[PDB]
């Protein structure tokens, strides 16, 4: 299957005292494997999956240096963007950035991406061509002019099509025993009476990996969405995920309802 490596950065200015909070986490597909938190003790990029542990000292030095320089660039940029939007030095603001690459089943680059946000809204994004920028407003347009002049897109493209893809293939071979394994959902249904003639049937998908899943109810072979409730997929806290969908049914009529589960860990789900 295809695989992705993604890094997520968040900087939050702290106007009352100090510098911004900066948190960075890296993922291979849905497995977090590194983190940096400016409020933590190490002041180092830290391992979060057993298979990255083996990386030598320069790996950890270079990754620590990189994500520290990014926190300082974000510190400056919080100042800059505050100026662009003409906002006061009193309020706290946020820059977030997500970047990464996907590879297909043979490990070749499929796509790269790098986009950021200012206070939870799109600010500037690298297009899929990895050559040009999408500026959401006029402050990001100013950034887009500076970056076209400096040919910043070129550097991102070289990283996303090279380094990003090379290390993701390395990680995939190194943590293959979990990263290239699917944990199909363990499923069961529960029945809860809602009165002396209605009941909720809840269909549970538990302990699965990757997180992507589709849970749906059919009544007599046709998809039902009325009287159903679908929760947001949530982490189990052990690297796997959970989801359920429920329907309210007339008691006695439960055999008409089937829950249909679709997940990568399943050969032809239904």
């Amino acid at each position: 299957g295809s695989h992705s490596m993604r890094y997520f950065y968040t900087s939050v200015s702290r106007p009352g005292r100090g510098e911004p909070r900066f948190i960075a986490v890296g993922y291979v597909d849905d497995t977090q494997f590194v983190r940096f938190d400016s409020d933590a003790a190490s002041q180092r990029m830290e391992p979060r999956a057993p298979w990255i542990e083996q990386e030598g000292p320069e790996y950890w030095d270079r990754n620590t240096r990189n994500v520290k320089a990014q926190s300082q660039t974000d510190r400056v940029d919080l100042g800059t963007l505050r100026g662009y939007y003409n906002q006061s030095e009193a309020g706290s603001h946020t820059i977030q950035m997500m970047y990464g690459c996907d590879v297909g089943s043979d490990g070749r680059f499929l796509r790269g991406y790098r986009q950021d946000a200012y206070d939870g809204k799109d600010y500037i994004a690298l297009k899929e061509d990895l050559r040009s920028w999408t500026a959401a407003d006029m402050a990001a347009q100013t950034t887009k002019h500076k970056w076209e002049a400096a040919h910043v897109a070129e550097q991102w493209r070289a990283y996303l099509e090279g380094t990003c893809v090379e290390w993701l293939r390395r990680y995939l071979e190194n943590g293959k025993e979990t990263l290239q394994r699917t944990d199909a959902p363990k499923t069961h249904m529960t029945h809860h009476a809602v009165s002396d003639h209605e009941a909720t049937l809840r269909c549970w998908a538990l302990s699965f990996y990757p997180a992507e899943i589709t849970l749906t109810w059919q009544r007599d072979g046709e998809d039902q969405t009325q009287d159903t409730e679908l929760v947001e997929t949530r982490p189990a806290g052990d690297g796997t995920f959970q989801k359920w969908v429920a329907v309210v049914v007339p008691s006695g009529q439960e055999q008409r309802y089937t829950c249909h589960v679709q997940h990568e860990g399943l050969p032809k789900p239904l």
Binding site: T10, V25, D37, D119, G120, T190, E232, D238, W244
Partner: protein, 99 residues
């Protein structure tokens, strides 16, 4: 922009009274990232509650998992108490083991 948290309180494993398990509070869909999440037993605050490293979804809204080891019982009430700029008072969501 500001966005209010979604909240799910649930155990990591099937809850069985008397068996040790983990209580989770998943807060997601919120912006800004500053938030206060407490896990509660019979109204009091549990002390060594842990959380994941802040990350966010495609629409840039954040999520965090708060968790602590616990044992479900017949009479203890567990809940998650969340406070955020978008809320005029803290939101308390009681743990229901069926969801």
């Amino acid at each position: 922009i500001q966005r209010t948290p979604k909240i799910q309180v649930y155990s990591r494993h099937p809850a069985e009274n008397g068996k040790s398990n983990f209580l989770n509070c998943y807060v997601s869909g919120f912006h800004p990232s500053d938030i206060e999440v407490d896990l509660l037993k019979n109204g009091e605050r549990i002390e060594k509650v842990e959380h994941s490293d802040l990350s966010f979804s495609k629409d840039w809204s954040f999520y965090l998992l708060y968790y602590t080891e616990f044992t479900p019982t017949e009479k203890d009430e567990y809940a998650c108490r969340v406070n955020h700029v978008t809320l005029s008072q803290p939101k308390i969501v009681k743990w229901d083991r069926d969801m």
